[PDB]
């Protein structure tokens, strides 16, 4: 599976979660930023590693990071 990590500079903009075509990510309550919420990656077993989440992340550098890992039927996006 791929590894998806959320770093503390997340501003809780929700753009990564909206961008994810596999529903890997969700917004969770968090006091660390003014938005009152942080990206979370609970379903990385479904992550294809498309990095649409990183493309969407406005922080410099990225608050969400995708480390491509061991390939599976799911991660390779295979319908056979």
Partner 1 sequence: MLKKGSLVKILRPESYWFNEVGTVVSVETSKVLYPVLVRFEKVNYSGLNSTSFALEELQEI
Partner 2 sequence: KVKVVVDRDVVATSFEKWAKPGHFSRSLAKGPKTTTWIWNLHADAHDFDSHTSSLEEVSRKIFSAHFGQLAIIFIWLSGMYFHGARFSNYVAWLSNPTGIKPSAQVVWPIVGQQILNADVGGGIQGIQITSGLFQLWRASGIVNELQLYVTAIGGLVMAGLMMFAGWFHYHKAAPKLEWFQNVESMLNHHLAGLLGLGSLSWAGHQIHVSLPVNKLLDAGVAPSSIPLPHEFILNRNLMAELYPSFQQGLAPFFTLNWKQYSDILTFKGGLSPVTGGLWLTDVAHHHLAIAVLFIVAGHMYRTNWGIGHSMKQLLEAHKGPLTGEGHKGLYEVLTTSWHANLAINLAMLGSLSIIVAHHMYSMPPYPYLATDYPTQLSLFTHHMWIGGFCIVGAGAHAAIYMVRDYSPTVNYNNVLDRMIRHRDAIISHLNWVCIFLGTHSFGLYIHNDTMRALGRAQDMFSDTAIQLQPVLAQWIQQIHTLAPGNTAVNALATASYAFGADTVTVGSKIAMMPIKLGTADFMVHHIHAFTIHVTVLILLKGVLFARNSRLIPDKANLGFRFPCDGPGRGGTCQVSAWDHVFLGLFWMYNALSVVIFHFSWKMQSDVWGTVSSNGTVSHITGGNFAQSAITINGWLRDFLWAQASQVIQSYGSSLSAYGLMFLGAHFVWAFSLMFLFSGRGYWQELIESIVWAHNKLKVAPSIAPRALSITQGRAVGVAHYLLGGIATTWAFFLARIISVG
Partner 3 sequence: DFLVHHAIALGLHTTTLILVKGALDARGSKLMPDKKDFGYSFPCDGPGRGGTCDISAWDAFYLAMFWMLNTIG
| DSSP secondary structure code for residue 73 in this structure | T
Work out what residue 4 binds among partner 2, partner 3, ligand SF4, none; the CB cut-off runs from 5 to 8 Å by kind.
none
Q: Counting contacts by CB under 6 A, is residue 63 touching ligand SF4?
A: yes
Work out what residue 31 binds among partner 1, ligand SF4, partner 2, none; the CB cut-off runs from 5 to 8 Å by kind.
partner 1
Neighbours of 68 (CB within 10 A): 13
Binding-site ranges for partner 3 (CB under 8 A)? 50-51, 54-55, 61, 65-68
């Amino acid at each position: 599976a791929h590894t998806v990590k959320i770093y503390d500079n997340c501003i809780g903009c929700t753009q990564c979660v909206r961008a994810c075509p596999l529903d890997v990510l969700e917004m969770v309550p968090w006091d660390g930023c003014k938005a009152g919420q942080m990206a979370s990656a609970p379903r990385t077993e479904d992550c294809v590693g498309c990095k649409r989440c990183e493309t969407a992340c406005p922080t410099d550098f990225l608050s969400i990071r995708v480390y491509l890992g061991g390939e599976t039927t799911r991660s390779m996006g295979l319908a056979y």
